[PDB]
Amino acid sequence: SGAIYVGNYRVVNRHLATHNDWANLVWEDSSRDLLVSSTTAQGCDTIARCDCQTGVYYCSSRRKHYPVSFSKPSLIFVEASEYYPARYQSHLMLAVGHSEPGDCGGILRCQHGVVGIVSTGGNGLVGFADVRDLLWLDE
Ligand SMILES: CN1c2ccccc2C[C@@H]1C(=O)N1CCC[C@H](C(N)=O)C1
Ligand SMILES: [Zn+2]
Numbered sequence: 001s002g003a004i005y006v007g008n009y010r011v012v013n014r015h016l017a018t019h020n021d022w023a024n025l026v027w028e029d030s031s032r033d034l035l036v037s038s039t040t041a042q043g044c045d046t047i048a049r050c051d052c053q054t055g056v057y058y059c060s061s062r063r064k065h066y067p068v069s070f071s072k073p074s075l076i077f078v079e080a081s082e083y084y085p086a087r088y089q090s091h092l093m094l095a096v097g098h099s100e101p102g103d104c105g106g107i108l109r110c111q112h113g114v115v116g117i118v119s120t121g122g123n124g125l126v127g128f129a130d131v132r133d134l135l136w137l138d139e
Contacts, residue, residue, distance in 0.1 A: 001060070002105025004114055005043030006137050011036050013104045013119055013129070015083035031090045033119045033129050036137070047137050048112035055110040057118065057126065061100040068095035068108070073130040078120055091130045092119065099126035 004011040012021060014028050014035040021037040028035040053072065056065050070093040080086040093108075099121025106118040108128045120127030131137065 001102070002058070002107060002117060004045050004047075004107065004117065004131065005039065006045045006047055006114075007043055007139075008039050009036050009043065009137055010039050011117070011131055011134075011137070013117060015081075016104060030084065031088070032092075033084075033089060034131070036134075045107075046113035047134070048110050048115050048132055049135075050110060050112045050132065052110035052112065052115065055108050055115050057095075057097070057108040057128065058106040059098055059103055059118075059126075060106055061103050062098060066097050068097050068126070070095035070108070070128060073133070076120075076127065078127075089120070089127075089129075091133070093128045093130055094120075095126050095128070096124060097126040098124070 014033050017035040024037040026036045073091040075088045075090050076092045078089045108115045116128040116130045119129040
């Protein structure tokens with residue numbers, strides 16, 4: 001689990017969005033596994049606007065942060081799950097690192113701010129949904 005809180009927005013994995021996220025919906029995209037809802041309180045986080053390909057992510061299944069090198073946002077085939085049929089997920093960045101079911105939502109950060117959130121895993125890999133292109137999160 002986990003979310004990004006920036007301005008009056010809350011960014012979560014679309015497959016983990018709550019009834020309240022959907023009732024306050026701003027934008028969602030199944031192909032990216034992202035959903036953004038509106039909040040009444042002002043959020044804590046800063047979004048990176050950069051092309052970093054190294055950073056640090058939080059892994060809840062180990063209660064620890066790990067440094068990672070990750071691929072540029074791209075279209076990657078993701079196997080069927082209880083949440084989605086087998087499909088290509090866009091704007092996804094892969095890295096070698098630990099991730100289990102339950103780790104989705106962990107934040108990936110570089111020196112410029114938040115880069116994205118854990119969205120895929122297994123096989124000693126961890127995939128992150130990029131948010132750096134969502135320029136409207138800041139205005
Ligand atoms: C975190 N993952 C994981 C880790 C170890 C072992 C098995 C898994 C599966 C899970 C996974 O990749 N998912 C499931 C939930 C929806 C995600 C999506 N963006 O489509 C895909
Ligand atoms: Zn950066």
